[PDB]
Structure formats: structure tokens, C-alpha cells
Amino acid sequence: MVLSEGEWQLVLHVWAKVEADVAGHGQDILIRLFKSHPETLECFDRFKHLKTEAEMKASEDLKKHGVTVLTALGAILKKKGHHEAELKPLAQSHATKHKIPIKYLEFISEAIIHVLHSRHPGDFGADAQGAMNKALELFRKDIAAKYKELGYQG
Ligand code: HEM
């Protein structure tokens, strides 16, 4: 994959909006993931009992984890594909400790796209959606290659 500089700019321009309310984006993303693909909730021992959207919005622990996820993702996107150093510790933990399959990274990618549409209509048009899709796909493909370098099938 090779994104155009334009595509990267579309990505980073919408990312600036995410940065204006990182915790709100993070909550909405994790909640949308858990709603759309409930099996994913089982991966979080401390959260896995939460039932309703309002319950999840009140979890300080879920909100903190959202920030943690989006901070790491932000640093990776800003590398414009030159993210081997940032991916390594993340592949390590997600392959070996959390045991997350690549398909669940696909599920969270869908949730990111939904939330960006939900919070930023007018500024998340087809072109920005396409560029964000491509950046997230690159991320997932590169993680999957890292898993295999560690000897794991993601
Ligand atoms: C954009 C995609 C993702 C990013 C950037 C991301 C990032 C992170 C970061 C930075 C951490 C803490 C440090 C670490 O353990 O490596 C973490 C922990 C974790 N991640 Fe992810 N992650 C993503 C997707 C997922 C998905 C889809 C799942 C499960 C469905 C998952 C499950 C977990 C779990 C279980 C932990 C440990 C949580 C805790 O006990 O506090 N991750 N992730």
C-alpha cells in the first residue's frame, strides 16, 4: 500500500478533530465496538459485565482505556506508514498477552469509521472515509505481518 500525501492529509485533518475530545471519541468507539460485535467485550475482564450504553458511558475505566487506545493510534497515524517502531510493542502485547485476532482490529476499525461519521458529519465525506479506511487497513496489515514475525497467526 502507498497512500497519497493528500490521503494522509485527509487522515490527519480528521485526527485533529478527534484530538479536540479524545476521551469522548474513545468512549464512543469502544461502546460502538462492544455493541456491534459483543464478543469483543469478553476481552476486557474488568468491563465485560457492562450491559447498557449508559452504563458504559459512566465507566471511568472504559473512558481511560479509550484515551490509551486513541493516543497510541494517533502516534501511529502521524508516522504516515513509517510506524514499525510504534507497532512493535503493540503487536507484542496484542499477539502474546491479550491474544487479539486481526479480525477484531477489523471490528474496531469499523467502529472508528462509524464514530467519525457520527461526530463529524460534513467533515467526514467519502474521500476522508476512504483515506481513513486505507490508513487503518495499512495498520492492520502491518500488525498482522508483525504477528507472523513473532511466530503467531493473527
Ligand atoms: C486501533 C486498535 C487498537 C489500539 C491502537 C490498541 C492499543 C492498546 C494499548 C496502547 C494498550 C495498552 C498497552 C498494551 O497492552 O499494549 C492496549 C491494551 C489492550 N488492548 Fe488494545 N488496541 C487496539 C485494539 C484492540 C482490540 C480490538 C481489542 C479487543 C477486542 C484490544 C484489547 C486490549 C486489551 C484486552 C488490552 C489490555 C487492557 C487492560 O487490561 O487495561 N485491543 N491496547
Curated annotation (Swiss-Prot):
Q: Name one GO molecular function term.
A: metal ion binding
Q: Which UniProt keywords apply?
A: Cytoplasm, Heme, Iron, Metal-binding, Muscle protein, Oxidoreductase, Oxygen transport, Phosphoprotein, Transport
Sites where Phosphoserine occurs are at S4
Q: Which residues make up the binding site for heme b?
A: H94
Supply the enzyme class, top level: oxidoreductase
Which InterPro entries does this entry report, sorted A to Z? Globin (IPR000971), Globin-like_sf (IPR009050), Myoglobin (IPR002335)
Residues annotated for nitrite binding in this entry = H65
Report if keyword Chloroplast is assigned.
no
Compartmental location: Cytoplasm, Sarcoplasm
Q: Which residues, renumbered to this chain, carry the PTM Phosphothreonine?
A: T68
Q: Which domain of life is it from?
A: Eukaryota
- This entry's Enzyme Commission designation comes to 1.7.-.-, 1.11.1.-
Domain Globin: start-end pairs: 2-148
Q: Which residues bind O2?
A: H65
A GO CC annotation recorded here is: extracellular exosome
GO biological process: what's one of them?
A: removal of superoxide radicals
* Annotated catalysed reactions: Fe(III)-heme b-[protein] + nitric oxide + H2O = Fe(II)-heme b-[protein] + nitrite + 2 H(+); H2O2 + AH2 = A + 2 H2O
Record has Metal-binding as a keyword: yes
What this chain does, per the entry, is described as: Monomeric heme protein which primary function is to store oxygen and facilitate its diffusion within muscle tissues. Reversibly binds oxygen through a pentacoordinated heme iron and enables its timely and efficient release as needed during periods of heightened demand. Depending on the oxidative conditions of tissues and cells, and in addition to its ability to bind oxygen, it also has a nitrite reductase activity whereby it regulates the production of bioactive nitric oxide.
Instruction: Describe its assembly.
Output: Monomeric.
Q: What is the name of the protein in this document?
A: Myoglobin
Species of provenance: Physeter macrocephalus (Sperm whale)
